[PDB]
Amino acid sequence: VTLCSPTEDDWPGMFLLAAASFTDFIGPESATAWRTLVPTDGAVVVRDGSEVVGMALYMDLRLTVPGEVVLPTAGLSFVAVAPTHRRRGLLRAMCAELHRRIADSGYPVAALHASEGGIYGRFGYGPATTLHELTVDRRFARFHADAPGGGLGGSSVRLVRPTEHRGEFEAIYERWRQQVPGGLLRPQVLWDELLAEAKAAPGGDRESFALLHPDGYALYRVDRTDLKLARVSELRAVTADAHCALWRALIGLDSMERISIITHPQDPLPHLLTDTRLARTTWRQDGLWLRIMNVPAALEARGYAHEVGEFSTVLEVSDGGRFALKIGDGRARCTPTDAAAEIEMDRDVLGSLYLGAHRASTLAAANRLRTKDSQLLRRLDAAFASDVPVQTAFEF
Amino acid sequence: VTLCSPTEDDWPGMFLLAAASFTDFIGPESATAWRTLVPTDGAVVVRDGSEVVGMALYMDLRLTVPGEVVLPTAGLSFVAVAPTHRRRGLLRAMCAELHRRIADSGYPVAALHASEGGIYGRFGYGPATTLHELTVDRRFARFHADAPGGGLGGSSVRLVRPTEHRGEFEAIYERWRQQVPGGLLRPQVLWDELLAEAKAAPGGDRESFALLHPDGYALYRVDRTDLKLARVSELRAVTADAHCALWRALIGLDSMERISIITHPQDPLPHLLTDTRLARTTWRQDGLWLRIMNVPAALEARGYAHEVGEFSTVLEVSDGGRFALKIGDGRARCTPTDAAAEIEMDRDVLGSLYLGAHRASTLAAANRLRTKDSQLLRRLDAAFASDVPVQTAFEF
Amino acid sequence: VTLCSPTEDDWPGMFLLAAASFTDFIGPESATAWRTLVPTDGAVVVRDGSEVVGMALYMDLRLTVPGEVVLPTAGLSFVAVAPTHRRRGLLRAMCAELHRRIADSGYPVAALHASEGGIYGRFGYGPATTLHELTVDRRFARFHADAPGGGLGGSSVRLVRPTEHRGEFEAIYERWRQQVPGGLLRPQVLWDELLAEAKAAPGGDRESFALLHPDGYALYRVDRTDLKLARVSELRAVTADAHCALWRALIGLDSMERISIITHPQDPLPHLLTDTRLARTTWRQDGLWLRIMNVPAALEARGYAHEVGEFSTVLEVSDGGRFALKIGDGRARCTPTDAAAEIEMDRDVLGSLYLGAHRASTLAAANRLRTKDSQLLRRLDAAFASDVPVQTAFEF
Amino acid sequence: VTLCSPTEDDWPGMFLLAAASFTDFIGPESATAWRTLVPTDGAVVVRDGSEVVGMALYMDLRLTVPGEVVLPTAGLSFVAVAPTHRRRGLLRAMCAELHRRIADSGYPVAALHASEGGIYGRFGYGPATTLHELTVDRRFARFHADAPGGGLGGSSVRLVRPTEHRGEFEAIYERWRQQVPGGLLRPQVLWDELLAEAKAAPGGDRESFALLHPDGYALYRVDRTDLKLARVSELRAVTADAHCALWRALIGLDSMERISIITHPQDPLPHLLTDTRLARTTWRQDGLWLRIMNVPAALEARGYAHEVGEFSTVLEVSDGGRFALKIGDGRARCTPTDAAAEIEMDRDVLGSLYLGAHRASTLAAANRLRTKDSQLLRRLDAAFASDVPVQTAFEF
Ligand SMILES: CCN(CC)CCNC(=O)CSc1nc(N)c2c3c(sc2n1)CCC3
Ligand SMILES: CCN(CC)CCNC(=O)CSc1nc(N)c2c3c(sc2n1)CCC3
Ligand SMILES: CCN(CC)CCNC(=O)CSc1nc(N)c2c3c(sc2n1)CCC3
Ligand SMILES: CCN(CC)CCNC(=O)CSc1nc(N)c2c3c(sc2n1)CCC3
């Protein structure tokens, strides 16, 4: 039970463990594409004296954080231990080895999507974004008088085949991801993959359609079994106009009873309708999880609310260092210190605060974040909050 | 079809319309108690030339708003039109008459709980608070190391009959409602009613139990049909310690699979667990709706974030006046003006912003709130936000 | 947190804990009756410095074991720890104290019905009987030619009110319980209770009917919600004739689609039908659990298969002693010894073997029962097996 | 309507009737393989004056019976009458003709798997084995301290592709089938078929995985629609160690909530867990059915319990002869006689007793098995019982 970087010869065994450990696995032809995003020495395997009984890897990603700042981000993925080798600390060992490599390569943050809500807290990952399913009974949906694009003349939205308008979707996603906290650069090979799932599969998913605006798009397909439900796989909009116009078109799908979409808690859709309640929240879950690899590098890299005045403090991260934090003009300076700590928190808590998804007040109430000064808590809340609301890019 | 204040002789007819129009109706013996909270000339009826084909009334309530300020609040309730008299503008006429009386009696705000999400926007009511059902699979629930009250020695929580500890529940609710935006004064007669629903009914709801802390309580009963689900009808806690201690006890109900509770979006419960995801959000809805009756009186009455610096502007409410708004030191001055408007919004939008439940950014994205300056939008967001998270008191 | 016998003053607090800890609780008026079966010093409570945070008790029962031998049996029941006092070893302490008293009072065995399948193994209780739900689609049910009582002339079964034929039900149950392993003496006060549940409750269970034979009875009621299902609460029959005759009558309920009954794995009903499969097994669970308090006293007290020849061995019970076991002529002699052990098992395993419900072969395969000689295993299997099939009397 | 052996020209018509009469039909490409196991003159068809309106056939099988004795067994299969020709005695005629051929070819027993529980009793077939679905909530499953292979060091179980380890599965199944009552020889062509269903089908079943031990294997796949359920299609284990080790691995499938398997009533899995009840019995059905073709040949061929002493009797089978049965030393001598019968039974009853699945006591209680001496009944029970528990090999 030794812990090595995989050879080319090791990948068939990894794909076997993958098939057994993840049901959503596409298969080796699709993995070719994602593999391209794994750097050299971005993967560890655990052989038994053989076959693969444990694997982890990271991908080179570009995460947009508050202040339209883009960080290089190690995306952890393809983590699996064989059912034959559970409770043997193979996960503790593999994660520890990748976190060493991620740190020494100079990534300030790591990120992942959790398959359980209880595994990842103990390795310093905090839930940083919130998925939020809205389901619209579109039979009752009337737009408010105040809603944009509710006059005479033509629609600016077209119904199209996704495959014939790849260029426009790329353009729009690129604009979107650069100005939205949680945004990820989506490389060429993941657009190849997104548009191979647009085509209908025999006895599988149905044909995907696109609504295309100059400044937005929405990919949607009808559900496999429930033929009165349209699922909106992806809606990107750079302007309120684009967002409203796309939803007028989705509400216009008169052969459907319901439109479902996985979106963020601040999605404005409910306020576009005469009746807010027609957009029922049916489902809610942690989205992207962040581990802050270098605290000073990460805290300094992002923007903060201009609205709160300049203020200073000492932050202590359990087994992560202690820092003089000074925040004014929406910039931060984070420097070493041995001065008495004013705030303590575990590294995962910092991960949750970082994209402005979770308020310090809330985490403090749970005693996940200790301080003795509530004015300092009001100020963290206010500073760390994101002007633009935080969103989940794509699963990896 | 004339519109009058009801005589004593009119109430039997109102109770008939009530029984037909509301399924959740307790019956005339229970109405005695709520009636006490309706002022003289707080009720209108519509007779047919007879019988009652339309009624509305308001109750005298005390709503806690940001800055621990308590406003006198007209609570609209018992609104019904006979099925025999629909689409006859009886609602438009009754609401218009009560809103006159509410305004002339000097109530700064009115409030209600909506039976549909689409009726109340057009009369100037905005959804001001958010209900949020959490359901815990308590079989998997382990508390985090950081959670308060997880050591040796005794528990501070007792299991009790609700009826024998009315005094303590009152004390605690009184403390809670005075420091929490959305808090309502609960008069003697509504505690009589709350504790008459604590006792098991033949072929109805099961016996209610209470967990009592020095600084918190939780009323709970097992579900009628689903005997592995406990419903938490009410949990009030004045301290993080009380809140944690009460949830340790609820998770300790080892004969249950699930605990459900209707709570607020900032409930810290999820952060108390090793696995945030065990506390699934199963349901979400508008709670309390506010109509701002006097804009200057209401805007001036509440507190604002100290964290944002002093700033000025002109707010225009559609058919509600135009005001020079000046906000600094968490106080506001709101005075008449004919100066060019910087912000426009309908009166319902103001209602939604007022308790800090909804961000101006979000309502602006839906074009429910027009401005041409996004720095002013950042500032409204920041000012109107509530330090203490907004909660829903009780239904009326 | 001290551990005492309850005063009369302590019972209200126990009834409160009961209501909170058991949903199936009838209420204090019904407890009067069961209380009569609890000896003096048969109950322990745990007060907090007060109120009751923990209780256990045993009842004086008479368990019929193989060889129509009747043992005095401590029936453990009413075991509860407050949700406010979990994981505090109150259960470990209460069970340890009752087991001392049960042992010193000279009970050879203790018994209980488990609310979870995982709590009771560690205190030396083994599942000793198996409940088995049969559900008959009675529309397709035709009796075999070989089935008794399928000729001309009159039926010997009558449809009656249970309350007017208490005497006959008692007579028959008394006959049944004396000749059937798992049989319990049912005292006067538990017949009072059984016949108070026969009468229909407002918005609860429906009226119970009885089919009465000279040598059998069946109590049945139609299900609350599913009106095409009859539930057979209890069927006792002393003769194959009685059993067949009662089932002809139940299959004769032509307004029902399904008859369900909770019975034992050897119930002959399936073999009475032309189609065995019409009697689907829908549910299966451990019934009665036994803890063997005195190994020599219990092993010596029961009968064994005459069919296996005389044979000897050394049995070792973990922390329960080591015994020279000699079995011939369906009697056993069990005497102390320090000779090398041939069979080892934990005390719960012995409990499972004792009424002949579980084969040693099976428990050996799970390594719950160690031996190095498989001829000795064949012999235990054969000896401990019950000629008459083991059944579950009533829940306590 | 004549009754002939099929020509090569008749098989297309049989395949048509097959497709219409059996939904689980694979299609003619798969039938090539099973056809190989049908002897010459093992099939009858009924033409209409044409097309095929009725078919039956038998396959040459090798059934393992108690005493590790292997009998040649006619496996009846592919029995169908056209919907156009029901209630015309085509089944009575076809079965009668095959039973003549099966008898004259010198097969001592015939076997089948029933599509209804009520058709096959009247042709002398008795349910001989019991299928038993266990479903494990594997989230709560902890193994007992007594369970084998729960120490440090390596696992002996590997996760593999089934297709690359055919040899090992064959070896293990061969060992298993020779020592287990109900065991069937599985020829080369049925391993070809088993491993063609291991591969995922488009819009059908998912990829099958194997857990391989030196002395056991388990084939499993995730359910089509329910993605949190793993179905265990086949688990063969020659040692308790193999069985425990394979289940540790299945419980180790951490992405599943439930493991279901179709197994036998004596499966030791429940006793391997700290909580027996986590292994719920969800489903139960007759498995293999036996018709005893030659009573003396079959009764003499199998082994009997050594534990019961030598004893004699006269058995009478309705329209099947009368025999002096003498049983001692686990051998039987069965010779003709006209002496007064002590036991009577129909031929199906004998089929049920033969593999030791059903106790004579039970069938006697249903009057399916008449005797006037209950000591003789105790002795049949004890003799016919199988030391090794009876299992169901594969469906045909
Ligand atoms: C629940 C687990 N999942 C399935 C893995 C997580 C991924 N969940 C997704 O939604 C995206 S599908 C996907 N994602 C990848 N990162 C990859 C990678 C491949 S192959 C692939 N496939 C080889 C290199 C890394
Ligand atoms: C969906 C409609 N509902 C039922 C009315 C709304 C009230 N919804 C509740 O949850 C509280 S029950 C209640 N509430 C009242 N305000 C009152 C009042 C009575 S009688 C009563 N009863 C006479 C004077 C006013
Ligand atoms: C799941 C828990 N259950 C409810 C207790 C177990 C009992 N389960 C039953 O089915 C019988 S109802 C019953 N049984 C009793 N032994 C008793 C006793 C009372 S009151 C009563 N009531 C006071 C003295 C002991
Ligand atoms: C419910 C009916 N079934 C479908 C037939 C029973 C068989 N049930 C099974 O599970 C095995 S699939 C199978 N079995 C066969 N014996 C055969 C045979 C073929 S083709 C085939 N296919 C030609 C010669 C005999």
JSON list of C-alpha atoms in Angstrom, two decimals, chain B residues 173-225:
[
{"chain": "B", "resi": 173, "resn": "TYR", "atom": "CA", "xyz": [-40.93, 35.16, 24.05]},
{"chain": "B", "resi": 174, "resn": "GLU", "atom": "CA", "xyz": [-41.15, 38.75, 25.48]},
{"chain": "B", "resi": 175, "resn": "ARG", "atom": "CA", "xyz": [-37.30, 38.94, 25.57]},
{"chain": "B", "resi": 176, "resn": "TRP", "atom": "CA", "xyz": [-37.07, 37.41, 22.04]},
{"chain": "B", "resi": 177, "resn": "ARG", "atom": "CA", "xyz": [-39.71, 39.62, 20.31]},
{"chain": "B", "resi": 178, "resn": "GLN", "atom": "CA", "xyz": [-38.16, 42.93, 21.61]},
{"chain": "B", "resi": 179, "resn": "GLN", "atom": "CA", "xyz": [-34.71, 42.26, 20.06]},
{"chain": "B", "resi": 180, "resn": "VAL", "atom": "CA", "xyz": [-35.67, 40.52, 16.72]},
{"chain": "B", "resi": 181, "resn": "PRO", "atom": "CA", "xyz": [-36.96, 42.25, 13.53]},
{"chain": "B", "resi": 182, "resn": "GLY", "atom": "CA", "xyz": [-40.36, 40.66, 12.67]},
{"chain": "B", "resi": 183, "resn": "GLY", "atom": "CA", "xyz": [-41.10, 40.20, 16.42]},
{"chain": "B", "resi": 184, "resn": "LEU", "atom": "CA", "xyz": [-44.77, 40.59, 17.51]},
{"chain": "B", "resi": 185, "resn": "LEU", "atom": "CA", "xyz": [-46.12, 41.29, 21.02]},
{"chain": "B", "resi": 186, "resn": "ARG", "atom": "CA", "xyz": [-48.21, 38.15, 21.81]},
{"chain": "B", "resi": 187, "resn": "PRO", "atom": "CA", "xyz": [-51.09, 39.17, 24.16]},
{"chain": "B", "resi": 188, "resn": "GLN", "atom": "CA", "xyz": [-52.53, 36.99, 27.03]},
{"chain": "B", "resi": 189, "resn": "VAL", "atom": "CA", "xyz": [-55.47, 35.69, 24.87]},
{"chain": "B", "resi": 190, "resn": "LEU", "atom": "CA", "xyz": [-53.11, 34.26, 22.13]},
{"chain": "B", "resi": 191, "resn": "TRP", "atom": "CA", "xyz": [-51.15, 32.30, 24.83]},
{"chain": "B", "resi": 192, "resn": "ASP", "atom": "CA", "xyz": [-54.56, 30.91, 26.01]},
{"chain": "B", "resi": 193, "resn": "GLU", "atom": "CA", "xyz": [-55.02, 29.74, 22.35]},
{"chain": "B", "resi": 194, "resn": "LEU", "atom": "CA", "xyz": [-51.40, 28.47, 21.81]},
{"chain": "B", "resi": 195, "resn": "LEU", "atom": "CA", "xyz": [-51.71, 26.24, 24.99]},
{"chain": "B", "resi": 196, "resn": "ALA", "atom": "CA", "xyz": [-55.22, 24.89, 24.02]},
{"chain": "B", "resi": 197, "resn": "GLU", "atom": "CA", "xyz": [-53.56, 23.46, 20.81]},
{"chain": "B", "resi": 198, "resn": "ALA", "atom": "CA", "xyz": [-50.80, 21.90, 23.04]},
{"chain": "B", "resi": 199, "resn": "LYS", "atom": "CA", "xyz": [-53.35, 19.24, 24.26]},
{"chain": "B", "resi": 200, "resn": "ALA", "atom": "CA", "xyz": [-54.07, 16.21, 21.96]},
{"chain": "B", "resi": 201, "resn": "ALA", "atom": "CA", "xyz": [-57.44, 16.29, 20.05]},
{"chain": "B", "resi": 202, "resn": "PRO", "atom": "CA", "xyz": [-59.54, 13.12, 19.35]},
{"chain": "B", "resi": 203, "resn": "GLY", "atom": "CA", "xyz": [-58.55, 11.89, 15.81]},
{"chain": "B", "resi": 204, "resn": "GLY", "atom": "CA", "xyz": [-56.57, 15.17, 15.34]},
{"chain": "B", "resi": 205, "resn": "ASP", "atom": "CA", "xyz": [-53.08, 16.44, 16.41]},
{"chain": "B", "resi": 206, "resn": "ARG", "atom": "CA", "xyz": [-51.01, 14.53, 19.08]},
{"chain": "B", "resi": 207, "resn": "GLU", "atom": "CA", "xyz": [-49.85, 15.80, 22.54]},
{"chain": "B", "resi": 208, "resn": "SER", "atom": "CA", "xyz": [-47.29, 18.71, 22.39]},
{"chain": "B", "resi": 209, "resn": "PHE", "atom": "CA", "xyz": [-44.09, 18.56, 24.49]},
{"chain": "B", "resi": 210, "resn": "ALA", "atom": "CA", "xyz": [-41.76, 21.44, 25.44]},
{"chain": "B", "resi": 211, "resn": "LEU", "atom": "CA", "xyz": [-37.98, 21.61, 25.93]},
{"chain": "B", "resi": 212, "resn": "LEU", "atom": "CA", "xyz": [-37.35, 24.45, 28.46]},
{"chain": "B", "resi": 213, "resn": "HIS", "atom": "CA", "xyz": [-33.98, 26.27, 28.91]},
{"chain": "B", "resi": 214, "resn": "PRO", "atom": "CA", "xyz": [-33.38, 29.35, 31.11]},
{"chain": "B", "resi": 215, "resn": "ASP", "atom": "CA", "xyz": [-33.09, 31.44, 27.83]},
{"chain": "B", "resi": 216, "resn": "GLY", "atom": "CA", "xyz": [-35.07, 29.37, 25.25]},
{"chain": "B", "resi": 217, "resn": "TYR", "atom": "CA", "xyz": [-37.94, 26.91, 24.61]},
{"chain": "B", "resi": 218, "resn": "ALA", "atom": "CA", "xyz": [-39.08, 24.56, 21.78]},
{"chain": "B", "resi": 219, "resn": "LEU", "atom": "CA", "xyz": [-42.70, 23.27, 21.41]},
{"chain": "B", "resi": 220, "resn": "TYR", "atom": "CA", "xyz": [-42.87, 20.04, 19.33]},
{"chain": "B", "resi": 221, "resn": "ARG", "atom": "CA", "xyz": [-45.38, 17.23, 18.59]},
{"chain": "B", "resi": 222, "resn": "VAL", "atom": "CA", "xyz": [-45.10, 14.01, 16.48]},
{"chain": "B", "resi": 223, "resn": "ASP", "atom": "CA", "xyz": [-46.85, 14.26, 13.04]},
{"chain": "B", "resi": 224, "resn": "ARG", "atom": "CA", "xyz": [-50.46, 12.84, 12.79]},
{"chain": "B", "resi": 225, "resn": "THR", "atom": "CA", "xyz": [-49.77, 10.23, 10.03]}
]
